[model samples]
Target: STFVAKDGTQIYFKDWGSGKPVLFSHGWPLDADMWEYQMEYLSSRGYRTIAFDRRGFGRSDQPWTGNDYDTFADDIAQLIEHLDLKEVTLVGFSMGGGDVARYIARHGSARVAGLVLLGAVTPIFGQKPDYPQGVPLDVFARFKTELLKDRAQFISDFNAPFYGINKGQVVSQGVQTQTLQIALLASLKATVDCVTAFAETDFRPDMAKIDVPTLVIHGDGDQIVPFETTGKVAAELIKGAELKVYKDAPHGFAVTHAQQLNEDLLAFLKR
Candidate 1:
């Protein structure tokens, strides 16, 4: 079903199972369908899984306005309030991590009981005066440049580093093909707009605002966000945040390393 945002954009969501809820936010250029594997596994294990398509991606309305983090975070708040979920664990992957942090910072964690960031972009994503480990703004600019010129090729090639393809890891043909299709579902304008939001938005203050149980899981081999700039720094900023490094995992570890992550999350939930 879909709910209308404050700005009037209809947001689409998937609610499966019926237990303690876990709301998942997807990565850039992809929709809520990206959490299919995680949802199927967790839902069957007595946990409710809710994932929503960000504005301009998946089944949600593609508005020319409200593609930034404040709106992204508010969309998350609307879903939580709309469903009346309690003690929810918010899992944010890739750019979706921005929503997790910003939501807590602006909306507070009254409903959320736990938080997880997987290969996220947080604690200031772009190269700033002090945060030297950040990826340069130009790097993100080039992504938009390439995205506009060759949408298909850019997403197709993104799969290589996304799943640690060159690292000798291989996903099933179905998974690979399906992921690309899900990514291509995003609106071209939203696709380009999000790159800047995730790349330039600074979540340093938002990081400290997270006080609930927190877990930061990331691949040390992530070629996209890179562990040094995001994962490592985030673990330190969020008090009591535990960092789990998946030796050589890639940006798409939720699919590549689902079993281990599922177990890890369940353990955290029960704790």
Candidate 2:
């Protein structure tokens, strides 16, 4: 059910089925449980699907401190080493996208079979002079400040942009409740702490280092993470990386578009 990370942090995970290993890393403010739909679907097809809660999120340890992307990647690397898992496909969603990118880049590709970034926030978050297309630093700073003020409202409001429901899209009632519950279960302190680190930390250089076959899956309707710049930039930076864009879908299309997403991933995995 759980594994102890290298730093002695207890990491919670769920594993099912059997075949090639597929490790699913979740986005910010959510845990491996977020990948339940994918795990069940893939597992039934004879693939081993593993999903885990990052430290201080979900069922994992909540160390009042010592949580950062680098440490997060180290925890994942240690999980792979601990299980002796190899040729594994790493799927990261949203902020988890940043983790997977930096993980393979910094830790090497020995344990990695492939990479899939779902609406990932790779390379960089802030719009510097050279990176004019990125989100403004002020925007990120304000988000961090507001999240600390009221985690619940921030989570609900964040989901609005994520679902594109902010623009009058009729999100299903089930989807809304699931999203909010995941947000409510998250650690407020961990959310704020990681937000600051994720925004300030840059993964641009990490893109040039990726060597394995990579896939960038994004939604055209993603309001939280822009497709034209962030995803496109990642596609360009990672040599030979493939890009797949879902039209009229929002950030959480991983669930909303599970059938199509799974088919595409299964095909890619077979390659």
Candidate 3:
């Protein structure tokens, strides 16, 4: 099913199972389908699993505007209020993490119970004068340049390092193909705008305002959002945020290490 946002965008979402609610926010160029493993496992364990496609991605409406964090986070707020959900365990992965952070920042956590981040891009992504550990701005600039030049090949090559398979490592070909397929489904305009959104938006102030119980999880070998710059710093910024590092896992470990990620999420929710 779907809900219309304030701006008249049709946001597609999956509402499944029953129990305590777990709302999932997906990563870049991917949609709620990325949470299939988590949704299936948690829903069967007596939990309500809700996953939504961001605007302009997956089955959601492709809007030329509203690609920034403010709109992204507001869309999440609308969904929560529409469902009248309380005590929601808000889970965001990769770029989706920014949404979770910004949502709590803009709307507060009155309706939220807990927060979970998987390979999340937050606290900040771009390198600033104060924080020098982030990826350079030039790198993102080149991404925009290449994307406009050849969107297909740009995303195709991104999957390799995105899944941590670029180092002469072998991962399942099936998963790689699936990742590419999902990415290609996104609107070309959104695909271009979101690059600037995730890479340039700074969420340090947003992270500071997160007052709920939070779990920050990331892989040590994530080539996409480096552990040191993103996840580690996020753990440090959010007061009392628990940090878990998956050894040798990549940015897409939610798929690569589904068993472990699901177990960790289950433990946190049940606790």
Candidate 4:
């Protein structure tokens, strides 16, 4: 159910199925429940699926400290060590992608079997000389300001564009509500810090160190983390990483395109 990190932060997680381990790291402001579809599907296929909430999100301890990439990666290390998991197929979604990259880079993939990044925010998110294609810092700054002022409305409004509705696509109210509900479960402090963490934290060097069997899956029409800068670039960085682009799918395709995503994941796992 849960385990305490070295810093005493209680990390909540769900462990299911039996066989090869597949540890999932969720996106920002969402918990392990976000991986329910994958956990249910993958576990049934003979894989042990474990999805966890970051220290400040979901049912975990909402501490105001250690919300950066280093701490995030360390918590993952703790989980793996505590469970004594081996040959883990580490899967991360969106911001969780950074967690996976940083984990292998910092902790080494001695016990890891493979890596799967779903619409991940990796290499780097903020615009810099080297990463000119990255998102503007001002955009994340504005988010930080709005998050501090009205986190609820910010998250509510965020779900629309996050799911790529801004592109004139229509999603069901049920999907929107489910997304909002999971987002609302996160603490304001965690939500705010993650905005900065996902947007500002650079995972370029971390990506370089990852030498496992890697799969980069992203929606071609992703609005949150653009396919070009995030997924496409990451695919090139990691040696022999396979890249899968879902046609016209968005960043929230994990929910919007669950069937296809599930099949893709299954194929990769079997490989």
Candidate 2 local lDDT, 1-271, one digit each (tens): 8898766778888888988999998988888878998888889998999888988888888777767888888888878887789899999998898778778877899889899988888867668788887788788889888987888888877777777787666677787778778767767878888887677778888898799999999998888778877787888899999999998778878766888998988888998
Question: lDDT: which is higher, 1 or 4?
Answer: 1
* Model 1 steric clash pairs: none
Error of 1 at 43 (Å): 1.5
List ranges where model 2 is wrong by over 4 Å: none
TM-score against truth, every candidate: 0.98, 0.95, 0.97, 0.97
Ordered list by TM-score, greatest first: 1, 3, 4, 2
**Which 10 residues in a row give candidate 2 its minimum summed lDDT?**
162-171
Candidate 3 C-alpha lDDT tens digits along 144-262: 99999988888888888888887544678887788788888889999989989988899999988999999999999898999999999999999989999998888888877889999
What TM-score would you give candidate 3 relative to the actual structure? Answer: 0.97
Please write out the lDDT profile of model 4 over residues 1-271, one tens digit for every residue: 9999988898899989899999999998788988999899999889999989898888899888999889999999999998999999999999999998999999999999999999999878889877777999999999899989998888889887788888766788887887778888888888988888898888888888998999999998898888999999999999999999988888888887898988988898899
Scanning candidate 1 in windows of ten residues, the lowest lDDT window is 124-133
Model 4 misplaced regions, further than 4 Å? 168-170
Colliding residue pairs in candidate 2: 123-204
